[PDB]
Amino acid sequence: MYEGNNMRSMMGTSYEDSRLNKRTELNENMSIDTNKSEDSYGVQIHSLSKQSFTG
Amino acid sequence: MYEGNNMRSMMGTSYEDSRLNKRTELNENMSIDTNKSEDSYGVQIHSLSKQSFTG
Amino acid sequence: MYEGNNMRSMMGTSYEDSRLNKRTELNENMSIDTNKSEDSYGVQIHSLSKQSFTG
Amino acid sequence: ELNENMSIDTNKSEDSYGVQIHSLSKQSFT
Amino acid sequence: ILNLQNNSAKYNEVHRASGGAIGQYTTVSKLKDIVILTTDSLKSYLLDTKIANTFQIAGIDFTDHVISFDDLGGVFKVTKEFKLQNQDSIDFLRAYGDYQSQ
Amino acid sequence: ANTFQIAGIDFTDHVISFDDLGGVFKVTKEFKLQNQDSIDFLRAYGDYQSQ
Amino acid sequence: AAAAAAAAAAAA
Amino acid sequence: AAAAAAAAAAAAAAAA
User: Fold this and answer.
1) Whole-angstrom distance, CA of residue E33 vs CA of residue E12
2) According to the lineage, what is the superkingdom (chain D) (predicted)?
3) CA D28-E62-E47 angle, 5° bins
4) Does H14 sit within 8 Å of B43, measured CB to CB?
5) Partners of E37 in the beta sheet?
């Protein structure tokens, strides 16, 4: 409530939100597409996308 | 049958009837949607929402 | 005389008077129109009625 | 005589499947 | 079930009535009026064994007439009339709201 | 699978699971650290600050 | 007059 | 005179 000048370099600006970023994820999905043995009644074994992890 | 006065605070307006206000009933529905193991079938997880539970 | 407030539930606006209803009167007449022995002189029987008196 | 029907309107257990509740109808009296 | 919908005098208990101690009385029921009472364990036994192993079920599934409970005893009844003497008994009773007992 | 009427009685949506339900450990008796290889093993997992 | 599923659920 | 249905080949698949 008291103003003064709340903006100083750090810890005058840290007690507010302070740059919400990099949320801990379920962006790649778990327990839904993963942990899923609920696959369709298939027709053949067609292919599996070989991914080359490069970085 | 006998009129008399019909004017007394209690045992007049209280000896014959009064306003039923609560009902002590099943609005929290139980045995129908509660006591119910009759759910769906299929792909699965995360049908689990929780509230702020202040009420 | 003193103006004050004159207001409380009782002992203000209840100290000097109240609502009057009934002063425990003679309405059933004793010694005016009943307590009679002044009846007629002639042919006779059956001034004897009966109500239901259920109330 | 028979008026109300036994063995057709009664003696049945070939009629119930639904996954439900409340056959509990306390009917009024005479 | 469907013992009940036969004309029988074996299924009532009218012998415990006042003027009807000896002698019989026949009555039936209508399937809009029978409910069963059970515990939840064999209710679940109905809800997996008798309804999911059974291949043809479309008329038989009488689970609509079933109410169950966790336990069928949580209450207490008194045989011998008695009196209260102990202070912790008062404390334990008004722990459940029984204030008036002394 | 081997039953026949699973139109309503399948509670499998509320089933989460794990491979094994323990890799975790709880302290008793309130010890201290004494031996070199112990904290060296702690260094293998990121625990640097304990000596 | 034959009927199936003789229960009739009533709610409030 | 009524006939109840026969699930002679109904292996029920559901989605959700």
Assistant:
1) 15
2) Viruses
3) 135
4) no
5) E67
Tokens of F5: 């009427």
CA distance, residue B32 to nearest chain G CA (Å):
9
Burial class of residue F48 (count of CB atoms within 10 Å of its CB; 0-12, 13-18, 19+): exposed
Chain B CB contacts of G12 under 8 Å are 25-27
Q: Do H7 and E59 touch (CB under 8 A)?
A: no
- Least CB–CB distance from D22: residue in G1, G4, G9: G9
Alpha helices in chain C (DSSP H): none
How many residues does this entry show for chain D?
Answer: 30
Residue in the block written with tokens 């009902």: B23
Helix, coil or strand: residue A31: coil
User: Given an 8 Å threshold on Cβ–Cβ distance, is E56 in contact with H5?
Assistant: no
Q: What's the rounded Cα separation, in Å, for the pair E77 and B32?
A: 31
* Residue entry with tokens 């002189």: C41
Q: What is the resolution of this structure in A?
A: 3.8
Tokens of E31: 């399937």
- In DSSP terms, E66 is beta-bridged to E36
Count contacts between E and H (CB, < 8 Å). 9
The first and second tokens of residue D24, run together, are 């509990």
Inter-residue contact A35 to F19 (CB < 8 Å):
no
Beta-carbon separation of C54 and B4 below 8 A: no
Residue identified by tokens 């005893």 is E73
Paired sense of beta strands E36-37 and E66-67, if any: parallel
Separation CA B5–CA C22 (nearest Å): 12
Method: cryo-EM
CA dist list (Å): C9 to B15, C18, H4: 27, 11, 76
